[PDB]
Amino acid sequence: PDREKALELAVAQIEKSYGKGSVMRLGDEARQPISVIPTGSIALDVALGIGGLPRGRVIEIYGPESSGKTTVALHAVANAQAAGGVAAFIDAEHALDPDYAKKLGVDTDSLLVSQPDTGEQALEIADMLIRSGALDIVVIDSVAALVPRAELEGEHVGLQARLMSQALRKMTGALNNSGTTAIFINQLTGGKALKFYASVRMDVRRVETLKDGTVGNRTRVKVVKNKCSPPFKQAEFDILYGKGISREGSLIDMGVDQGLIRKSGAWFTYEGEQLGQGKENARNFLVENADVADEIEKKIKEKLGI
Incomplete structure (x- = not known):
């Protein structure tokens, strides 16, 4: 009970005296x-x-x-x-x-x-x-x-x-x-x-x-x-x-990582829509459709800090 205070208090001194990311x-x-x-x-x-x-x-x-x-x-x-x-x-x-x-x-x-x-x-x-x-x-x-x-x-x-x-x-x-x-x-x-x-x-x-x-x-x-x-x-x-x-490639990977993009089969799907069969087709789809890539990007950033 009194330990969590002491620690928080110690972390604060460390933060003040050395900088924001010091611990x-x-x-x-x-x-x-x-x-x-x-x-x-x-x-x-x-x-x-x-x-x-x-x-x-x-x-x-x-x-x-x-x-x-x-x-x-x-x-x-x-x-x-x-x-x-x-x-x-x-x-x-x-x-x-x-x-x-x-x-x-x-x-x-x-x-x-x-x-x-x-x-x-x-x-x-x-x-x-x-x-x-x-x-x-x-x-x-x-x-x-x-x-x-x-x-x-x-x-x-x-x-x-x-x-x-x-x-x-x-x-x-x-x-x-x-x-x-x-x-x-x-x-x-x-x-x-x-x-x-x-x-x-x-x-x-x-x-x-x-x-x-x-x-x-x-x-x-x-x-x-x-x-x-x-x-x-x-x-x-x-x-x-x-x-x-490959910007679009990282959007797919973090897409599936975050569950925003579902990999039902070799097919990558998003929002009910299908993105492509295999990774390269999905990658290619996202470059031809820059609007959806930005959509997927915005959602990934939203679902996290970024």
Whole structure:
């Protein structure tokens, strides 16, 4: 009886002295913000709790080469722009494919891009850009490529981590004020600081190759760190070569997950209407009928926080 008070009281001190998400029960309902940046998959948006990536915060998306992290990052960029936001892409990797970015939603013409000479220049440019107040999102591709000036100039080893720590310390205050989201893409170094500064960390992986005959990959994302909603939630969704995340595919999956879409036979049905026989026909139905996809989306968001 008097214990529940003491705990609630303790949770409150922790909340006051360290911040809103400093302690959570894993069954807690998410703290719904005004605006977020959707990720392209409703499943991933739900796994994040707040319906997308938070604003004004450091975000890490990591995984193996071609795991899908950059695609997740580019959808964040597409969605941020679709809401009238400006985007930046700090590129020390030189891997970006704008044609891919166009197809999945990015306004590449509008995309600010910078190919910095050094690790510090990359982070400093990001900082100037953030402190402007004008950006909604900045992507850093990538953490590993942020090589320090001294290394590049040929002039001990360990200051790459000290560079990030110094940068993140200064950057984090700028992000909160501006409301800009910073996505750091990272591989499986210098991320030891990023691990603690990031409000969300996402572990992206290829789980299974999709197929017509012999197209894409089923992708799995675990939210290993989340200061905005209970962490350790995971999601799956499809990334189709040349197209990106199958938005419609995630609506079906979360559709059946939520009982809004019934899978009577190979047929997926919705509201008495039939969507298609098998997944691909249902997926295809929802892209041709954007109105019903929005209907299904609205219902899924309604039935949860999002």
